[PDB]
Design a protein around this ligand. Sequence first.
Ligand SMILES: [Mg+2]
Ligand SMILES: [Mg+2]
Ligand SMILES: [Mg+2]
Ligand SMILES: [Mg+2]
Ligand SMILES: [Mg+2]
Ligand SMILES: [Mg+2]
Ligand SMILES: [Mg+2]
Ligand SMILES: [Mg+2]
Ligand SMILES: [Mg+2]
Ligand SMILES: [Mg+2]
Ligand SMILES: [Mg+2]
Ligand SMILES: [Mg+2]
Ligand SMILES: [Mg+2]
Ligand SMILES: [Mg+2]
Ligand SMILES: [Mg+2]
Ligand SMILES: [Mg+2]
Ligand SMILES: [Mg+2]
Ligand SMILES: [Mg+2]
Ligand SMILES: [Mg+2]
Ligand SMILES: [Mg+2]
Ligand SMILES: [Mg+2]
Ligand SMILES: [Mg+2]
Ligand SMILES: [Mg+2]
Ligand SMILES: [Mg+2]
Ligand SMILES: [Mg+2]
Ligand SMILES: [Mg+2]
Ligand SMILES: [Mg+2]
Ligand SMILES: [Mg+2]
Ligand SMILES: [Mg+2]
Ligand SMILES: [Mg+2]
Ligand SMILES: [Mg+2]
Ligand SMILES: [Mg+2]
Ligand SMILES: [Mg+2]
Ligand SMILES: [Mg+2]
Ligand SMILES: [Mg+2]
Ligand SMILES: [Mg+2]
Ligand SMILES: [Mg+2]
Ligand SMILES: [Mg+2]
Ligand SMILES: [Mg+2]
Ligand SMILES: [Mg+2]
Ligand SMILES: [Mg+2]
Ligand SMILES: [Mg+2]
Ligand SMILES: [Mg+2]
Ligand SMILES: [Mg+2]
Ligand SMILES: [Mg+2]
Ligand SMILES: [Mg+2]
Ligand SMILES: [Mg+2]
Ligand SMILES: [Mg+2]
Ligand SMILES: [Mg+2]
Ligand SMILES: [Mg+2]
Ligand SMILES: [Mg+2]
Ligand SMILES: [Mg+2]
Ligand SMILES: [Mg+2]
Ligand SMILES: [Mg+2]
Ligand SMILES: [Mg+2]
Ligand SMILES: [Mg+2]
Ligand SMILES: [Mg+2]
Ligand SMILES: [Mg+2]
Ligand SMILES: [Mg+2]
Ligand SMILES: [Mg+2]
Ligand SMILES: [Mg+2]
Ligand SMILES: [Mg+2]
Ligand SMILES: [Mg+2]
Ligand SMILES: [Mg+2]
Ligand SMILES: [Mg+2]
Ligand SMILES: [Mg+2]
Ligand SMILES: [Mg+2]
Ligand SMILES: [Mg+2]
Ligand SMILES: [Mg+2]
Ligand SMILES: [Mg+2]
Ligand SMILES: [Mg+2]
Ligand SMILES: [Mg+2]
Ligand SMILES: [Mg+2]
Ligand SMILES: [Mg+2]
Ligand SMILES: [Mg+2]
Ligand SMILES: [Mg+2]
Ligand SMILES: [Mg+2]
Ligand SMILES: [Mg+2]
Ligand SMILES: [Mg+2]
Ligand SMILES: [Mg+2]
Ligand SMILES: [Mg+2]
Ligand SMILES: [Mg+2]
Ligand SMILES: [Mg+2]
Ligand SMILES: [Mg+2]
Ligand SMILES: [Mg+2]
Ligand SMILES: [Mg+2]
Ligand SMILES: [Mg+2]
Ligand SMILES: [Mg+2]
Ligand SMILES: [Mg+2]
Ligand SMILES: [Mg+2]
Ligand SMILES: [Mg+2]
Ligand SMILES: [Mg+2]
Ligand SMILES: [Mg+2]
Ligand SMILES: [Mg+2]
Ligand SMILES: [Mg+2]
Ligand SMILES: [Mg+2]
Ligand SMILES: [Mg+2]
Ligand SMILES: [Mg+2]
Ligand SMILES: [Mg+2]
Ligand SMILES: [Mg+2]
Ligand SMILES: [Mg+2]
Ligand SMILES: [Mg+2]
Ligand SMILES: [Mg+2]
Ligand SMILES: [Mg+2]
Ligand SMILES: [Mg+2]
Ligand SMILES: [Mg+2]
Ligand SMILES: [Mg+2]
Ligand SMILES: [Mg+2]
Ligand SMILES: [Mg+2]
Ligand SMILES: [Mg+2]
Ligand SMILES: [Mg+2]
Ligand SMILES: [Mg+2]
Ligand SMILES: [Mg+2]
Ligand SMILES: [Mg+2]
Ligand SMILES: [Mg+2]
Ligand SMILES: [Mg+2]
Ligand SMILES: [Mg+2]
Ligand SMILES: [Mg+2]
Ligand SMILES: [Mg+2]
Ligand SMILES: [Mg+2]
Ligand SMILES: [Mg+2]
Ligand SMILES: [Mg+2]
Ligand SMILES: [Mg+2]
Ligand SMILES: [Mg+2]
Ligand SMILES: [Mg+2]
Ligand SMILES: [Mg+2]
Ligand SMILES: [Mg+2]
Ligand SMILES: [Mg+2]
Ligand SMILES: [Mg+2]
Ligand SMILES: [Mg+2]
Ligand SMILES: [Mg+2]
Ligand SMILES: [Mg+2]
Ligand SMILES: [Mg+2]
Ligand SMILES: [Mg+2]
Ligand SMILES: [Mg+2]
Ligand SMILES: [Mg+2]
Ligand SMILES: [Mg+2]
Ligand SMILES: [Mg+2]
Ligand SMILES: [Mg+2]
Ligand SMILES: [Mg+2]
Ligand SMILES: [Mg+2]
Ligand SMILES: [Mg+2]
Ligand SMILES: [Mg+2]
Ligand SMILES: [Mg+2]
Ligand SMILES: [Mg+2]
Ligand SMILES: [Mg+2]
Ligand SMILES: [Mg+2]
Ligand SMILES: [Mg+2]
Ligand SMILES: [Mg+2]
Ligand SMILES: [Mg+2]
Ligand SMILES: [Mg+2]
Ligand SMILES: [Mg+2]
Ligand SMILES: [Mg+2]
Ligand SMILES: [Mg+2]
Ligand SMILES: [Mg+2]
Ligand SMILES: [Mg+2]
Ligand SMILES: [Mg+2]
Ligand SMILES: [Mg+2]
Ligand SMILES: [Mg+2]
Ligand SMILES: [Mg+2]
Ligand SMILES: [Mg+2]
Ligand SMILES: [Mg+2]
Ligand SMILES: [Mg+2]
Ligand SMILES: [Mg+2]
Ligand SMILES: [Mg+2]
Ligand SMILES: [Mg+2]
Ligand SMILES: [Mg+2]
Ligand SMILES: [Mg+2]
Ligand SMILES: [Mg+2]
Ligand SMILES: [Mg+2]
Ligand SMILES: [Mg+2]
Ligand SMILES: [Mg+2]
Ligand SMILES: [Mg+2]
Ligand SMILES: [Mg+2]
Ligand SMILES: [Mg+2]
Ligand SMILES: [Mg+2]
Ligand SMILES: [Mg+2]
Ligand SMILES: [Zn+2]
Lengths: 151, 59, 101, 112, 116, 140
Amino acid sequence: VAYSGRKIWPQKHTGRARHGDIGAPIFVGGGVVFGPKPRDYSYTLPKKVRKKGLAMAVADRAREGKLLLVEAFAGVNGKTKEFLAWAKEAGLDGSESVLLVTGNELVRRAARNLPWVVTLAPEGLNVYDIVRTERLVMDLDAWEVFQNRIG
Amino acid sequence: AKHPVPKKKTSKARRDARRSHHALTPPTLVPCPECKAMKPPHTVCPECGYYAGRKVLEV
Amino acid sequence: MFAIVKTGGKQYRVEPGLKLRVEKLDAEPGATVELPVLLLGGEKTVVGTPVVEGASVVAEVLGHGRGKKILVSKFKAKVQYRRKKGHRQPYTELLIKEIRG
Amino acid sequence: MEAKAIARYVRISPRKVRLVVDLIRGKSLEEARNILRYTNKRGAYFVAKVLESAAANAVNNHDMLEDRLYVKAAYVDEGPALKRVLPRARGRADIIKKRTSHITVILGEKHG
Amino acid sequence: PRAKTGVVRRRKHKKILKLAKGYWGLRSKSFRKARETLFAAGNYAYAHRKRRKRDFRRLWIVRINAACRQHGLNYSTFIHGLKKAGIEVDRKNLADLAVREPQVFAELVERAKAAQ
Amino acid sequence: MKTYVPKQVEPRWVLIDAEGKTLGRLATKIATLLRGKHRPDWTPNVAMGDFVVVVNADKIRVTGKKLEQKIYTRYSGYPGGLKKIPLEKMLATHPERVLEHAVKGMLPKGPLGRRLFKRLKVYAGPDHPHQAQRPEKLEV
RNA sequence: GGAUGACCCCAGGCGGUAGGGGAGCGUUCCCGAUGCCGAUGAAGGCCGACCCGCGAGGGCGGCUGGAGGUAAGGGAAGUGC
RNA sequence: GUGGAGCCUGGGAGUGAGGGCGCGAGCGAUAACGUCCGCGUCCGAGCGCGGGAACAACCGAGACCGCCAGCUAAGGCCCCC
RNA sequence: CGUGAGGGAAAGGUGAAAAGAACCCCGGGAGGGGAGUGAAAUAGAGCCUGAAACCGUGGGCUUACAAGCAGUCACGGCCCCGAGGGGUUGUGGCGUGCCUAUUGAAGCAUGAGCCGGCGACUCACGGUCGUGGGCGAGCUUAAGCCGUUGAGGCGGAGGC
Ligand SMILES: [Mg+2]
Ligand SMILES: [Mg+2]
Ligand SMILES: [Mg+2]
Ligand SMILES: [Mg+2]
Ligand SMILES: [Mg+2]
Ligand SMILES: [Mg+2]
Ligand SMILES: [Mg+2]
Ligand SMILES: [Mg+2]
Ligand SMILES: [Mg+2]
Ligand SMILES: [Mg+2]
Ligand SMILES: [Mg+2]
Ligand SMILES: [Mg+2]
Ligand SMILES: [Mg+2]
Ligand SMILES: [Mg+2]
Ligand SMILES: [Mg+2]
Ligand SMILES: [Mg+2]
Ligand SMILES: [Mg+2]
Ligand SMILES: [Mg+2]
Ligand SMILES: [Mg+2]
Ligand SMILES: [Mg+2]
Ligand SMILES: [Mg+2]
Ligand SMILES: [Mg+2]
Ligand SMILES: [Mg+2]
Ligand SMILES: [Mg+2]
Ligand SMILES: [Mg+2]
Ligand SMILES: [Mg+2]
Ligand SMILES: [Mg+2]
Ligand SMILES: [Mg+2]
Ligand SMILES: [Mg+2]
Ligand SMILES: [Mg+2]
Ligand SMILES: [Mg+2]
Ligand SMILES: [Mg+2]
Ligand SMILES: [Mg+2]
Ligand SMILES: [Mg+2]
Ligand SMILES: [Mg+2]
Ligand SMILES: [Mg+2]
Ligand SMILES: [Mg+2]
Ligand SMILES: [Mg+2]
Ligand SMILES: [Mg+2]
Ligand SMILES: [Mg+2]
Ligand SMILES: [Mg+2]
Ligand SMILES: [Mg+2]
Ligand SMILES: [Mg+2]
Ligand SMILES: [Mg+2]
Ligand SMILES: [Mg+2]
Ligand SMILES: [Mg+2]
Ligand SMILES: [Mg+2]
Ligand SMILES: [Mg+2]
Ligand SMILES: [Mg+2]
Ligand SMILES: [Mg+2]
Ligand SMILES: [Mg+2]
Ligand SMILES: [Mg+2]
Ligand SMILES: [Mg+2]
Ligand SMILES: [Mg+2]
Ligand SMILES: [Mg+2]
Ligand SMILES: [Mg+2]
Ligand SMILES: [Mg+2]
Ligand SMILES: [Mg+2]
Ligand SMILES: [Mg+2]
Ligand SMILES: [Mg+2]
Ligand SMILES: [Mg+2]
Ligand SMILES: [Mg+2]
Ligand SMILES: [Mg+2]
Ligand SMILES: [Mg+2]
Ligand SMILES: [Mg+2]
Ligand SMILES: [Mg+2]
Ligand SMILES: [Mg+2]
Ligand SMILES: [Mg+2]
Ligand SMILES: [Mg+2]
Ligand SMILES: [Mg+2]
Ligand SMILES: [Mg+2]
Ligand SMILES: [Mg+2]
Ligand SMILES: [Mg+2]
Ligand SMILES: [Mg+2]
Ligand SMILES: [Mg+2]
Ligand SMILES: [Mg+2]
Ligand SMILES: [Mg+2]
Ligand SMILES: [Mg+2]
Ligand SMILES: [Mg+2]
Ligand SMILES: [Mg+2]
Ligand SMILES: [Mg+2]
Ligand SMILES: [Mg+2]
Ligand SMILES: [Mg+2]
Ligand SMILES: [Mg+2]
Ligand SMILES: [Mg+2]
Ligand SMILES: [Mg+2]
Ligand SMILES: [Mg+2]
Ligand SMILES: [Mg+2]
Ligand SMILES: [Mg+2]
Ligand SMILES: [Mg+2]
Ligand SMILES: [Mg+2]
Ligand SMILES: [Mg+2]
Ligand SMILES: [Mg+2]
Ligand SMILES: [Mg+2]
Ligand SMILES: [Mg+2]
Ligand SMILES: [Mg+2]
Ligand SMILES: [Mg+2]
Ligand SMILES: [Mg+2]
Ligand SMILES: [Mg+2]
Ligand SMILES: [Mg+2]
Ligand SMILES: [Mg+2]
Ligand SMILES: [Mg+2]
Ligand SMILES: [Mg+2]
Ligand SMILES: [Mg+2]
Ligand SMILES: [Mg+2]
Ligand SMILES: [Mg+2]
Ligand SMILES: [Mg+2]
Ligand SMILES: [Mg+2]
Ligand SMILES: [Mg+2]
Ligand SMILES: [Mg+2]
Ligand SMILES: [Mg+2]
Ligand SMILES: [Mg+2]
Ligand SMILES: [Mg+2]
Ligand SMILES: [Mg+2]
Ligand SMILES: [Mg+2]
Ligand SMILES: [Mg+2]
Ligand SMILES: [Mg+2]
Ligand SMILES: [Mg+2]
Ligand SMILES: [Mg+2]
Ligand SMILES: [Mg+2]
Ligand SMILES: [Mg+2]
Ligand SMILES: [Mg+2]
Ligand SMILES: [Mg+2]
Ligand SMILES: [Mg+2]
Ligand SMILES: [Mg+2]
Ligand SMILES: [Mg+2]
Ligand SMILES: [Mg+2]
Ligand SMILES: [Mg+2]
Ligand SMILES: [Mg+2]
Ligand SMILES: [Mg+2]
Ligand SMILES: [Mg+2]
Ligand SMILES: [Mg+2]
Ligand SMILES: [Mg+2]
Ligand SMILES: [Mg+2]
Ligand SMILES: [Mg+2]
Ligand SMILES: [Mg+2]
Ligand SMILES: [Mg+2]
Ligand SMILES: [Mg+2]
Ligand SMILES: [Mg+2]
Ligand SMILES: [Mg+2]
Ligand SMILES: [Mg+2]
Ligand SMILES: [Mg+2]
Ligand SMILES: [Mg+2]
Ligand SMILES: [Mg+2]
Ligand SMILES: [Mg+2]
Ligand SMILES: [Mg+2]
Ligand SMILES: [Mg+2]
Ligand SMILES: [Mg+2]
Ligand SMILES: [Mg+2]
Ligand SMILES: [Mg+2]
Ligand SMILES: [Mg+2]
Ligand SMILES: [Mg+2]
Ligand SMILES: [Mg+2]
Ligand SMILES: [Mg+2]
Ligand SMILES: [Mg+2]
Ligand SMILES: [Mg+2]
Ligand SMILES: [Mg+2]
Ligand SMILES: [Mg+2]
Ligand SMILES: [Mg+2]
Ligand SMILES: [Mg+2]
Ligand SMILES: [Mg+2]
Ligand SMILES: [Mg+2]
Ligand SMILES: [Mg+2]
Ligand SMILES: [Mg+2]
Ligand SMILES: [Mg+2]
Ligand SMILES: [Mg+2]
Ligand SMILES: [Mg+2]
Ligand SMILES: [Mg+2]
Ligand SMILES: [Mg+2]
Ligand SMILES: [Mg+2]
Ligand SMILES: [Mg+2]
Ligand SMILES: [Mg+2]
Ligand SMILES: [Mg+2]
Ligand SMILES: [Mg+2]
Ligand SMILES: [Mg+2]
Ligand SMILES: [Mg+2]
Ligand SMILES: [Mg+2]
Ligand SMILES: [Zn+2]
């Protein structure tokens, strides 16, 4: 804190309480006791746990019928209306949130602005995103790497 | 002496009880028989300048 | 004609037409229950020894409820012992119907 | 119907003026005028101004009649105090509060 | 993140202050004196609801005694007679009879002399 | 059912001839009458006992050597201010005080007890002024 | 008892300082949230003799206020005088 | 003898100023509301309740909450009561 | 403030918009009362909200023979909202503040004028036990690298 270390008034005989300097946490203006300092919240969760987790999350959607694999994306060439068309045609009316996973940059841009769509490259697939969304949609090529990842 | 000092704060009831005698009494006034303006008895009237039937002073 | 009945470890003077809160009876609202009589007075006097063989007072249960909350608080000085409990005593409301003397 | 006047931030101490205000609560406007005139206190000058201002309001704004006016309510509330240093022996400085009043007078008409 | 007192403490103090409505000077006005006053009161209440049970019983007894002695006996004799008669009417009631139903109290007195 | 509370009652006046009765044991009975504890509707927080008139107080009796030895006592608040007056003398100068002082000590302290003592009317000599009240002669 | 902490029944324990343990309440902030409540009135304040809760509290109502608030379930602390 | 008994392993303590009383001693003066040990008790922590005029440790008795019901304990029953 | 080195404050908010109140009235003025503006003016510039201590006006109940840790229990009176409640308190019963420290405090032992706000068991890294999970003769990666731009992965050196 910014203040000086001078003892503000003598220890005895002033009729007041004893104090040291005015930086002490007992003074308004003073320092804070055990407040926050810069902190690293991270930790290394076991790799097998992440692996097992990745798998189980997909598994959970699979078990709900909410996982859909797709061969390729028709006419989607980077336009939201294009993805939107395709999406409708594939049973995604936007009434359910979708984690769209594909390595196709053109398909990701096209879908990324939709409020109900979260998009990812297959290397990015992770459990918070799967669990956050109601429906999982993958390229086969996406699905291939995920299989390779949970192996 | 050794600096006496109140031992307890005086309660509002006590303070106000002490002021039970603090009310002003309103001025005692009588009419001036020449101009009928109220004034203190035994004073030359400041309204008209009369006292004891006569004109005592310019007002 | 009045009766002294005993319900709930307590005794009450009851006359037909009286509403009375007593300790909670295990009996559905609208049921009618029979109270013991320790004494009958009014026109004739009969004195139980302790209860009178034939008498009963017939009461209809209007309902069961909970008393207005009492705060039961405990405090002991200089020991930081403090406890605060809310209490509502269950009761049953009865209407006294007849005195079957 | 009532007419009121408030003098706010009058530089005099509430306890002092109230003593004067108390002399006129409930009185006819006329009696109140006489009383203030011959009341020997600083506060009389201030109460007198609020009274007369309230009277004017009664007559000019609120369609009330001077001959019927009486002090219906009157009170002194305390305003923000002026804090001032009063130097004492041995280097101590005391703090004198020069206090402040908000004086309210409220007139009604005494009917028939 | 920081969690400043904010609203919470004002809210505890009012709770206490409201319970202290009615008390004298600072006791209804200052949270501290309120609370102090309140500890006392929780204990008295507790203690006094215990003792109300006594307060009333002593009263019933004084009454029963007065009524007995109109019939030429005392409370101790009357109670023993009832015990021996097997009459279990409690004092709350003996006392009500003594005032509201004197013919009934008399018969009880009778039963009591007889029972001995 | 709540315990009964009497509505205001008209108070009974009673007359007691003190002649030859023993001071202390007459006193307790007077006290009872004053509290109202002969009444089956006794209530501790109101004055509902009898007014008591006592005559021939000067002819009260006392066992042992008390006339000589019982000392009544008064403290004036001044230095040296303890007066000791013996029974004999008190009887000889203000006899009604002897009964009065005894009964007073057998009443409760407090506002009510003080009030009850006012309901006691004690006279030396056989007569009293309370005829207007037609006091009921009481043997105790 | 029924199967499992659903709740009923019987019995017993339940003063407490240092202190061990358990279960909760509330404050700031995060996910929930591109959501939901909100000018037909956010938070905050002032009332309440009403409802729920053993309690810490939580509701509901009236007045004030005038633009924010934020669930179920979890997470993290500058968390209660 | 099934008890908030016991034993074993481990986690967390606090305490390491005691005090009155009875009994057994020492010290002291067959003194102290003295001091120091032993056995026990209570207060400590039961300054909660009844009695003892009042009163931590004497007598009675171990307060989960409620009742305008009953029986008792020590102590009491002439009035205060 | 201090000769000086040096110490070192407090102090934010009208309203969407100034539309920031022309003009009249009382007043020396300040201030107010009308008029006007505004959705709102106890948003009027001493301006959002506007708590509490503290001061006042008005009302209800109460109080001048009374003995008090200020309450509590009971009853009765009066006042209020409408077999009930609420406010008030006459009488009667009972009743030794809070915290601290102590063998022991109402204690004539400490601390506190009252109120509001600030105000004290945390964090890193190691350890030890317990606990929820993952894998299990095995478990685990560090720095870094790649990727992301609130996406994760690779990395076996090393450790147990
Ligand atoms: Mg510094
Ligand atoms: Mg500096
Ligand atoms: Mg510095
Ligand atoms: Mg320094
Ligand atoms: Mg320095
Ligand atoms: Mg230094
Ligand atoms: Mg010192
Ligand atoms: Mg000092
Ligand atoms: Mg100081
Ligand atoms: Mg100081
Ligand atoms: Mg100092
Ligand atoms: Mg310091
Ligand atoms: Mg220093
Ligand atoms: Mg410093
Ligand atoms: Mg700071
Ligand atoms: Mg600062
Ligand atoms: Mg700072
Ligand atoms: Mg700090
Ligand atoms: Mg620190
Ligand atoms: Mg520090
Ligand atoms: Mg820290
Ligand atoms: Mg860092
Ligand atoms: Mg950590
Ligand atoms: Mg890390
Ligand atoms: Mg999107
Ligand atoms: Mg979403
Ligand atoms: Mg001197
Ligand atoms: Mg002097
Ligand atoms: Mg000198
Ligand atoms: Mg002198
Ligand atoms: Mg002096
Ligand atoms: Mg002093
Ligand atoms: Mg004051
Ligand atoms: Mg006052
Ligand atoms: Mg005084
Ligand atoms: Mg204390
Ligand atoms: Mg105490
Ligand atoms: Mg304490
Ligand atoms: Mg202690
Ligand atoms: Mg405590
Ligand atoms: Mg004068
Ligand atoms: Mg005029
Ligand atoms: Mg000088
Ligand atoms: Mg000052
Ligand atoms: Mg000053
Ligand atoms: Mg913040
Ligand atoms: Mg804080
Ligand atoms: Mg705060
Ligand atoms: Mg607060
Ligand atoms: Mg608090
Ligand atoms: Mg609040
Ligand atoms: Mg609170
Ligand atoms: Mg009161
Ligand atoms: Mg007060
Ligand atoms: Mg006060
Ligand atoms: Mg106040
Ligand atoms: Mg409390
Ligand atoms: Mg109790
Ligand atoms: Mg008790
Ligand atoms: Mg009992
Ligand atoms: Mg007899
Ligand atoms: Mg018996
Ligand atoms: Mg019996
Ligand atoms: Mg008799
Ligand atoms: Mg004489
Ligand atoms: Mg007494
Ligand atoms: Mg049980
Ligand atoms: Mg148990
Ligand atoms: Mg027990
Ligand atoms: Mg316990
Ligand atoms: Mg446990
Ligand atoms: Mg815990
Ligand atoms: Mg909750
Ligand atoms: Mg909180
Ligand atoms: Mg919490
Ligand atoms: Mg944040
Ligand atoms: Mg968001
Ligand atoms: Mg939002
Ligand atoms: Mg809406
Ligand atoms: Mg609107
Ligand atoms: Mg509204
Ligand atoms: Mg907030
Ligand atoms: Mg909030
Ligand atoms: Mg609330
Ligand atoms: Mg609100
Ligand atoms: Mg906004
Ligand atoms: Mg939230
Ligand atoms: Mg939440
Ligand atoms: Mg979560
Ligand atoms: Mg803190
Ligand atoms: Mg076992
Ligand atoms: Mg044990
Ligand atoms: Mg044990
Ligand atoms: Mg152990
Ligand atoms: Mg621990
Ligand atoms: Mg240790
Ligand atoms: Mg220790
Ligand atoms: Mg040691
Ligand atoms: Mg020691
Ligand atoms: Mg020892
Ligand atoms: Mg020991
Ligand atoms: Mg020792
Ligand atoms: Mg010993
Ligand atoms: Mg012996
Ligand atoms: Mg010995
Ligand atoms: Mg020895
Ligand atoms: Mg000797
Ligand atoms: Mg002793
Ligand atoms: Mg000793
Ligand atoms: Mg000894
Ligand atoms: Mg010895
Ligand atoms: Mg011992
Ligand atoms: Mg200790
Ligand atoms: Mg004991
Ligand atoms: Mg013990
Ligand atoms: Mg004891
Ligand atoms: Mg005691
Ligand atoms: Mg205790
Ligand atoms: Mg005792
Ligand atoms: Mg005792
Ligand atoms: Mg006693
Ligand atoms: Mg009941
Ligand atoms: Mg018995
Ligand atoms: Mg015995
Ligand atoms: Mg005795
Ligand atoms: Mg007496
Ligand atoms: Mg210098
Ligand atoms: Mg300079
Ligand atoms: Mg310096
Ligand atoms: Mg500063
Ligand atoms: Mg603005
Ligand atoms: Mg602006
Ligand atoms: Mg002008
Ligand atoms: Mg002018
Ligand atoms: Mg102007
Ligand atoms: Mg004006
Ligand atoms: Mg104007
Ligand atoms: Mg308009
Ligand atoms: Mg509007
Ligand atoms: Mg407003
Ligand atoms: Mg506003
Ligand atoms: Mg201001
Ligand atoms: Mg605003
Ligand atoms: Mg404001
Ligand atoms: Mg203001
Ligand atoms: Mg205010
Ligand atoms: Mg008043
Ligand atoms: Mg007198
Ligand atoms: Mg009087
Ligand atoms: Mg009382
Ligand atoms: Mg009573
Ligand atoms: Mg009422
Ligand atoms: Mg009452
Ligand atoms: Mg009351
Ligand atoms: Mg009594
Ligand atoms: Mg005391
Ligand atoms: Mg004591
Ligand atoms: Mg405390
Ligand atoms: Mg302290
Ligand atoms: Mg110390
Ligand atoms: Mg010491
Ligand atoms: Mg010591
Ligand atoms: Mg004291
Ligand atoms: Mg002393
Ligand atoms: Mg003292
Ligand atoms: Mg000292
Ligand atoms: Mg002290
Ligand atoms: Mg010390
Ligand atoms: Mg100071
Ligand atoms: Mg204060
Ligand atoms: Mg504070
Ligand atoms: Mg720690
Ligand atoms: Mg650890
Ligand atoms: Mg572990
Ligand atoms: Mg694993
Ligand atoms: Mg395994
Ligand atoms: Mg190692
Ligand atoms: Zn003249």
